[PDB]
Amino acid sequence: MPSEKTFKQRRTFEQRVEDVRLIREQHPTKIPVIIERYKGEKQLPVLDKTKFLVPDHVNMSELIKIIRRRLQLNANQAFFLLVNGHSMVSVSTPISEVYESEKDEDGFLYMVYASQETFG
Amino acid sequence: DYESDDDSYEVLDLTEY
Numbered sequence: 559m560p561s562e563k564t565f566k567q568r569r570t571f572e573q574r575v576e577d578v579r580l581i582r583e584q585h586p587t588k589i590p591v592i593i594e595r596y597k598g599e600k601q602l603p604v605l606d607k608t609k610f611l612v613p614d615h616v617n618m619s620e621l622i623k624i625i626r627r628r629l630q631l632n633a634n635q636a637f638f639l640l641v642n643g644h645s646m647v648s649v650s651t652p653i654s655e656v657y658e659s660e661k662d663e664d665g666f667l668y669m670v671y672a673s674q675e676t677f678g
Numbered sequence: 679d680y681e682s683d684d685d686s687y688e689v690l691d692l693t694e695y
Binding site for chain 1: 685
């Protein structure tokens with residue numbers, strides 16, 4: 559997915575429900591999360607991670623750190639993870655608690671990411 | 679490495695502790 563075009567070109571909603579079913583069966587200690595760049599301002603690079611499988615005991619601040627580094631964003635470059643469309647950039651919480659709080663209709667969690675929370 | 683694609687994948691591309 560990181561070398562191809564935008565995530566929907568790889569996998570659709572019902573096929574992401576199949577991903578949740580397979581991952582919950584094989585590795586239930588990891589949490590199913592989707593990640594996508596903000597459509598209103600595509601300022602950040604096309605380093606399309608698309609999804610991640612986070613261990614239960616990883617902090618949201620630690621997830622932010624690995625994802626900021628994988629997106630090549632140095633300390634001077636602005637960056638935010640928007641859980642279900644809203645920022646949690648300052649929070650220390652374990653990913654499972656953030657998950658059960660913001661888990662969507664079919665068992666996945668969403669994170670939109672951006673250089674600023676809104677622009678247009 | 680594997681990161682984001684299919685099935686048996688290590689999508690966070692790290693060994694947890």
